[PDB]
Design a protein around this motif. Structure first.
Motif, PDB file in Angstrom:
ATOM      1  N   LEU A   1      -8.871   7.022   4.763  1.00 31.62           N
ATOM      2  CA  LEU A   1      -8.793   6.592   3.403  1.00 31.62           C
ATOM      3  C   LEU A   1      -7.369   5.716   3.096  1.00 31.62           C
ATOM      4  N   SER A   2      -6.082   6.560   3.864  1.00 32.41           N
ATOM      5  CA  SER A   2      -4.981   5.954   3.835  1.00 32.41           C
ATOM      6  C   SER A   2      -4.947   4.711   4.654  1.00 32.41           C
TER       7      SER A   2
ATOM      8  N   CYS B   1      -6.607   1.882   3.220  1.00 32.97           N
ATOM      9  CA  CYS B   1      -5.579   1.274   2.005  1.00 32.97           C
ATOM     10  C   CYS B   1      -4.618   0.323   2.716  1.00 32.97           C
TER      11      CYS B   1
ATOM     12  N   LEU C   1      -1.747   9.272  -3.164  1.00 34.13           N
ATOM     13  CA  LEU C   1      -2.678   9.791  -2.435  1.00 34.13           C
ATOM     14  C   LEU C   1      -2.136  11.293  -1.780  1.00 34.13           C
TER      15      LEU C   1
ATOM     16  N   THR D   1     -11.253  -2.923  -6.929  1.00 29.00           N
ATOM     17  CA  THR D   1      -9.713  -2.482  -6.642  1.00 29.00           C
ATOM     18  C   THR D   1      -8.858  -3.329  -7.424  1.00 29.00           C
TER      19      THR D   1
ATOM     20  N   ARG E   1      -5.300   2.127  -6.684  1.00 25.50           N
ATOM     21  CA  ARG E   1      -4.573   0.947  -7.114  1.00 25.50           C
ATOM     22  C   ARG E   1      -4.318   0.989  -8.546  1.00 25.50           C
TER      23      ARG E   1
ATOM     24  N   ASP F   1       0.469   3.485  -3.094  1.00 25.34           N
ATOM     25  CA  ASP F   1      -1.035   4.029  -3.035  1.00 25.34           C
ATOM     26  C   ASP F   1      -0.914   5.412  -2.252  1.00 25.34           C
TER      27      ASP F   1
ATOM     28  N   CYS G   1      -5.307  -3.761   5.069  1.00 23.36           N
ATOM     29  CA  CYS G   1      -6.220  -4.576   3.924  1.00 23.36           C
ATOM     30  C   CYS G   1      -5.966  -6.209   4.135  1.00 23.36           C
TER      31      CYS G   1
ATOM     32  N   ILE H   1      -9.807   4.464  -3.756  1.00 24.32           N
ATOM     33  CA  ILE H   1      -8.883   3.659  -3.418  1.00 24.32           C
ATOM     34  C   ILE H   1      -8.590   2.816  -4.781  1.00 24.32           C
ATOM     35  N   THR H   2      -9.770   2.461  -5.495  1.00 20.89           N
ATOM     36  CA  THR H   2      -9.876   1.860  -6.784  1.00 20.89           C
ATOM     37  C   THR H   2      -8.663   2.709  -8.050  1.00 20.89           C
TER      38      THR H   2
ATOM     39  N   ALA I   1       0.789  -1.146   0.143  1.00 22.41           N
ATOM     40  CA  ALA I   1       0.002  -0.163  -0.053  1.00 22.41           C
ATOM     41  C   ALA I   1       0.837   1.364   0.119  1.00 22.41           C
TER      42      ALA I   1
END
Ligand SMILES: CC1(C)CC=C(c2ccccc2)c2cc(C(=O)Nc3ccc(C(=O)O)cc3)ccc21
Ligand SMILES: CC1(C)CC=C(c2ccccc2)c2cc(C(=O)Nc3ccc(C(=O)O)cc3)ccc21
Lengths: 11, 240, 239, 11
Positions: free
Chosen positions: B154-155, B158, B96, C206, B210, B92, B161, B206-207, B89
């Motif tokens: 959000l971070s 991410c 961000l 995702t 990625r 990502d 997960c 997040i989509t 992550a």
């Protein structure tokens, strides 16, 4: 296997 | 009746707003400064810009590790899982972060030292053919008007997960993630009352991250082949 | 007869229908196998490629027909319809083939019934992405997704306001909003037992974007591996 | 400059 990432995570 | 009581999640939300703010300075809380280096036109790679970019990326990654450890439960996971979550992550979040430092009028991005580069300079610094794509993403965040609290959650969502390959206790990670989802769903609700569709709209970012980080992994490889020196060790460990 | 509920059910039924009539279920297909390079991995099996790419082409045609049935899609500009289709092609090709996965045989079944094992999928073209794709097919199975969920998931991938070079991102973006709501409501109506299933299912997209990004890279590699051009439709979709 | 996808669109 990860010298840095591991040291930072230990403290 | 207006909003019900959610003491724990309110607290969690704060503990994460704090972890983010204190590991990532806001745009308004920064002393911007520009550079004249290759500001005019797109080049293959500006070594001067790369050097500073690589250095700032390294530091940001250090901040990301710090931000992770400040997430309730993270230091609970095994050292192996902590590494696994971070490695998957990291990009990502790098994306961000730099995208929440976008100033739409000057079309620039701002690093944590105040360094402010324009679209061309970001390209020349290492973004390459991913420039316009990342800038498009930046402009897509603006209408969402995310704050430090939403960016932090959000971070955290991410990073935390349980689907990542090689997780030893993936189910343990799942457990830590769901309160983060509820926390976000609620905070968005109080903040944006009867203006919904926003929870899934933000979550789906997040989509987008990625997708970009996947292409980003290849950009790093092409850079590794382009730069004169070696790719900073911490960077290689995050991409290995 | 709350208004939005009625509209959302209507939207839901229409998409379930569009999915079923453009993508047969695994259980209703006549499975058949082949012996081509089934035992060991090779760089490329030209015979498997041909059949594979032919079936993919025919799936892309179905995907187009599916888009045209999505409420509001033919209301977008021509350029945006094209753009959305191209940027979501792999996403849906991935999703579709991964819902045709059979765990015992370790196989994926195409719409003509063709069933290939993991090695043949690799030899057909998946190559270095093979294991990644199969891993995603396994994480998907327990979700027990049906045509409504899979169809809505495909609609969401397709009607995406964040795609590059859209003429009317706002229009597309707003078009996606009721899709998100229908999915949430359907999931909740269908799975009251497990909450937070909306994010779980919804965020499988995702994985799709990740594999799709790699997919586009994979296709470039194949371009120079295959002693010939890919089917013209696939060419156009991958531009 | 392919013509397939557009022809497929128009049905
Ligand atoms: C995927 C992309 C667009 C291109 C690949 C990046 C990269 C990563 C490692 C080495 C070389 C390039 C890359 C790096 C970053 C990056 O370092 N972001 C970042 C850098 C610094 C800061 C900060 O100072 O606050 C915040 C975010 C952001 C986006 C990426
Ligand atoms: C991205 C990946 C993992 C590898 C690249 C694929 C590919 C796409 C176009 C040209 C060459 C390779 C590729 C193609 C497909 C694909 O064609 N899926 C698909 C093909 C046919 C059917 C059907 O007959 O029902 C269902 C799904 C699925 C997954 C991929």
């Amino acid at each position: 296997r990860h010298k840095i990432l591991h040291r930072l995570l230990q403290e | 009746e207006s909003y019900e009581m959610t003491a724990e999640l309110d607290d969690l939300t704060e503990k994460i707003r704090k972890a983010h703010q204190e590991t990532f300075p806001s745009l308004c809380q920064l002393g911007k400064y520009t550079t004249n280096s290759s500001a005019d036109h797109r080049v293959r790679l500006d070594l001067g810009l790369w050097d500073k970019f690589s250095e700032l990326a390294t530091k940001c990654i250090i901040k990301i590790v710090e931000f992770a450890k400040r997430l309730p439960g993270f230091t609970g996971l095994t050292i192996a899982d902590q590494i696994t979550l971070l490695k998957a992550a990291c990009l990502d979040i790098l994306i961000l972060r730099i995208c929440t430092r976008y100033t739409p009028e000057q079309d620039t991005m701002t690093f944590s030292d105040g360094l402010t580069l324009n679209r061309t300079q970001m390209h020349n610094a290492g973004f390459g053919p991913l420039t316009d794509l990342v800038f498009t993403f930046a402009n897509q965040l603006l209408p969402l008007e995310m704050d430090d609290t939403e960016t932090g959650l959000l971070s955290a969502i991410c990073l935390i997960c349980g689907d990542r390959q090689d997780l030893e206790e993936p189910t343990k990670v799942d457990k830590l993630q769901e309160p983060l989802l509820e926390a976000l769903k609620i905070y968005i609700r109080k903040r944006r009352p009867s203006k919904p569709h926003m929870f899934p709209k933000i979550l789906m970012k997040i989509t987008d991250l990625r997708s970009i980080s996947a292409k980003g992994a290849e950009r790093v490889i092409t850079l590794k082949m382009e730069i004169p020196g070696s790719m900073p060790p911490l960077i290689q460990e995050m991409m290995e």
